[PDB]
Amino acid sequence: ADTKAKLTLDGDTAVELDVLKGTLGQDVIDIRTLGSKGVFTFDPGFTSTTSCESKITFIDGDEGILLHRGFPIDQLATDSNYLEVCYILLNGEKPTQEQYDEFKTTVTRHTMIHEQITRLFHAFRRDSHPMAVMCGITGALAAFYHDSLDVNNPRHREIAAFRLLSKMPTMAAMCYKYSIGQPFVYPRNDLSYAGNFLNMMFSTPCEPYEVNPILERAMDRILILHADHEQNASTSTVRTAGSSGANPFACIAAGIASLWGPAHGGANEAALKMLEEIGKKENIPEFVRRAKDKNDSFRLMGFGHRVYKNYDPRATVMRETCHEVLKELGTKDDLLEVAMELENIALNDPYFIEKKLYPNVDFYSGIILKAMGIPSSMFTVIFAMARTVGWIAHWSEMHSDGMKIARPRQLYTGYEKRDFKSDIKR
Amino acid sequence: ADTKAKLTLDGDTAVELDVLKGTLGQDVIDIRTLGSKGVFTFDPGFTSTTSCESKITFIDGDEGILLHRGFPIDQLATDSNYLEVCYILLNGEKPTQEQYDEFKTTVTRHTMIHEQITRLFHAFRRDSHPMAVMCGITGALAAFYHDSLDVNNPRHREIAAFRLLSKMPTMAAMCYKYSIGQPFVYPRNDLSYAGNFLNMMFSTPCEPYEVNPILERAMDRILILHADHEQNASTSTVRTAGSSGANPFACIAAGIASLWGPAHGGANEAALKMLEEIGKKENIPEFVRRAKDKNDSFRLMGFGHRVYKNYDPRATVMRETCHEVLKELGTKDDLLEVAMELENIALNDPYFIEKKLYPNVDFYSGIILKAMGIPSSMFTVIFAMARTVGWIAHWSEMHSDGMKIARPRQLYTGYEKRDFKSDIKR
């Protein structure tokens, strides 16, 4: 708390800047005045610049700590349910029974997507990546829901939120169904958020589908564990597009694309094939498939993490859930010995030890989803679906702040004024 | 280096920071490494933070200066054409007849849109706002043109930039046609950029369409004057979405939704309602829309601008062109001479002189569009169409700097860790 008192800057004149502090994390130097003074900093990437005040999620990476509204992720993972985590993320407090009852009725109230929006899916190619379809549909909702686009109207944000929150799972399962050639399945009010998703993903009209409570709870946890992750690339995209006036649907659509960005990154893309393919218990085990690693693409395959130093806190509940599911799905897991083997190589090989390519939450998420017969193409779709509530929370907090359209500066380093005379004659 | 030699960040031990200078504009203070010392600045709104270094466009608000790669906008709008200007923004120099012809050739051979995408157009509701359909189509492009989404592969990036530059006009026109129920028109390889767009907008199978030379020039100038505008809110979104690695089409879609943004509120169209909803001098102004305007209701009709102090350098030639157009059409303007009174008001009304609500480029642009027979629900689609080359140049530059990952920090002021105890069920 000490030096928080104040401090100053000066190159040709003296300027006194305050030192603000957080309820957690380090202090910051309020430079909200240097601008007028005529002083501007230079920070490409905003790594030494704090862009906002937030009360949603707290992360202490070096300590492996993750909190949502103060609540540790481990307690929410095992003690709460996705919908309740959604309420907490958007409201800031655990809901009373009555409050949760209404939140759930409202959500359940608008899960269906207008039949014309549903017509949109049939205009895509059956071979398109389900993630590209997911971005396409979300980026088109505005043409069908033009009545909740004014982000300056509180009732608008309210409506838009429930619309995205209630329809994202319906949408994601439709992307899957369209990609495999099966008929779409309507949302059922009698099912849970997780149970309903599994139902829309897997049931067909040829027999009633029965959700395994084990797999359901597993999905619920996968969802809670991806609800939000503080500021990062996709959330910064959602915040930037948002403060520029862009409608909520478009904001979330940009978030989805940002989240997908790394995947189709080339070096990551190439390494994605190697994992999902090479695996005949001769390659992965005898460090054969892992003998090739020029392109790292580690966090993508579920190894290492950019923020957390030694371990991903979200991975604790997920690993135990992975253990559970692999056993519930009994003995139908052979090739999935690479799962056990890769974890062993990630924890016992010096390279991984040195560079810290430890299994993160997605390593186990991937193992679970796979064991469930869900293709890898649907991995990012499901994570985006889960992350949508966090995006809405951040988006809603950016608005509630002060609606200050952010306008960063540029250091001009181009040509000085020069006269123009074309060299062409058309 | 005027009022800025070298600076010292004072806390408890003088920290000297290097000052940087641009070729034009204000000097900045370097702080890239501060965070690497636990020292972070706080600046929501980015009032003092310089997010990047750029060589594309230079603006001097108080001086009414606007340059593109060093060339004055007035010069470009007068002695160039849209394609040549696109070449400049993208390449940094004016083209040779050979570089230009090569560029022109590549552009025209990518103008046709995939047949399957046309099916997507027909899935949108007939009453969809053109801009919404434009967002929906552009954001769906990654699903199809999936062989150019590797943002780190220089080959993919040029093929994508060319695809966007070529197809935007095609898509924009189709948005119009769809809204009025007329058949879509294919690009014409023998027509100029602006002439091709006018033909795609208004031609019909019933008879040949004749491209008026003065209108062809008026439109090319509108495109020129909206090609780029430095670090604004929409460009910021593009750059930020692009930093995460999001595909080219998703980033441009985000820029279009961002440009649309400040036009979704009620008082937004409510104001931009009577601006055209009435065509008669003593009616819209005459002791009417004097206070009948409620929230913004000024800045949306083309009056004033936060960038420029006294006037908009783009409006100079745009006003000149306005004359040529009204003059030319005559019987497609004269009735609309309610503009002169609006302009007169803005020039002498104490309220307008007060708010510095001078007529900007969009006041004059709107008049030319209202004169050519273009509906106000197509204005921002056309502006976005012209601005895409600008968005593409900025996105590319950001990727030349090594994909500057725009990931700002937060000041956490929420709950400290607290135990989670659920009150619920359901």
Added chain:
Amino acid sequence: TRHTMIHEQITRLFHAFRRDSHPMAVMCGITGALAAFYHDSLDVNNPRHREIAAFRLLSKMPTMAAMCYKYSIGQPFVYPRNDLSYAGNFLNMMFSTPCEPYEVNP
């Protein structure tokens, strides 16, 4: 009850209208098109024809009206159910969705 369903191709006609069209204009449009699908009961001079035509219009009008409503709000069409009353069935086709069984208040 035997002929409440409308031929699936006639059902295809609805999707050619605008979602924003007035449901009354759609109702007139569809009815004025039935002749192209039911050309076997057009001779008004044949008693059996009138007989058939009558039951066709009588049994299908409610199915049609509820479809106009569903199309105007973006919800999926609902098939006629033999186990319901004329009034109960209309309410069902107007209000139920596949997301939960609809229960008609007597």
